[PDB]
Design a protein around this ligand. Structure first.
Ligand SMILES: NS(=O)(=O)c1ccc2c(c1)[C@H]1CCC[C@H]1[C@@H](c1ccc(O)cc1Cl)N2
Ligand SMILES: [Zn+2]
Length: 258
């Protein structure tokens, strides 16, 4: 009886195994655009992905993860609210059963069809396992997906999903360039928060881009053909793998922009 996104094991249940679920800096949150303050001291974000080395794509029973070689400073996130250098380790998405839901963060209570998380760890903690124990261990770059025009840079992801339909399946996934998933603008909101799944550790600087990317109906439909279950188990479609908005509590969301 492991955590998941069903009626009996979903987000309202997680606090029983992970009491930090009701903590002081939980993610995601609603971004009230009128209450977020412009912080003219925030530096522009630095996204250096030109040497990014993708290795593998994995269905972990909760989402699919595209994993990167993070054994050197290849793909890094710096500037914005961050002190130091954060190394890209993996990306994944959260998505809905319908185009009207799927994102974890909301903007004035608006839900997007999906949300991309580019996950980075602080290189002063040496490994991701150490970083998740620190209040400034991770920086997650969050990008909203809306349904409209196709995102050409996503199609290589969409087309390998047949090969990792069920929990525990992995496939080689080399030479994938995550710059193809970025919107034009790097305008962002930032706040201190948490992992959005168990173990819900309060180790994340969230950096949420204002500008969504557009993906096609056919592209998101392929996300929705994935399975939460293992091979040879009854089919349960991988949909609505998103946690809802958590209380902001004693936090301010800052904007990089007016
Ligand atoms: N939706 S998200 O981007 O907020 C997110 C949610 C859950 C997890 C991650 C990212 C990644 C990133 C850091 C820890 C890691 C993971 C975990 C797995 C195995 C481990 O041994 C440790 C950890 Cl903590 N859990
Ligand atoms: Zn995530």
């Amino acid at each position: 009886h492991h955590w998941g996104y069903g009626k009996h094991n979903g987000p309202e249940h997680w606090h029983k195994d992970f009491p930090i679920a009701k903590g002081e800096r939980q993610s995601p949150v609603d971004i009230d655009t009128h209450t977020a303050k412009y912080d003219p001291s925030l530096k522009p974000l630095s996204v250096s992905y030109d040497q990014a080395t993708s290795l593998r794509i994995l269905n972990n029973g909760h989402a699919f993860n595209v994993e990167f070689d993070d054994s050197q400073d290849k793909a890094v996130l710096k500037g914005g609210p961050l002190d130091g250098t954060y190394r890209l380790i993996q990306f994944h998405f959260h998505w809905g059963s319908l185009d009207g839901q799927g994102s974890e963060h909301t903007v004035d209570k608006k839900k997007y069809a999906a949300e991309l998380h580019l996950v980075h760890w602080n290189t002063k903690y040496g490994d991701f396992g150490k970083a998740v124990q620190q209040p400034d261990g991770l920086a997650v770059l969050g990008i909203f997906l809306k349904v409209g025009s196709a995102k050409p840079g996503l199609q290589k992801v969409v087309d390998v999903l047949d090969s990792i339909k069920t929990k525990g399946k992995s496939a080689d996934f080399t030479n994938f360039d995550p710059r193809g998933l970025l919107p034009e603008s790097l305008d962002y909101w930032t706040y201190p928060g948490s992992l959005t799944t168990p173990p819900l550790l309060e180790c994340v600087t969230w950096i949420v881009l204002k500008e969504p990317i557009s993906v096609s109906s056919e592209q998101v439909l392929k996300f929705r053909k994935l399975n939460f279950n293992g091979e040879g188990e009854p089919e349960e479609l991988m949909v609505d793998n998103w946690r809802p908005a958590q209380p902001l509590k004693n936090r301010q969301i800052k904007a990089s922009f007016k």
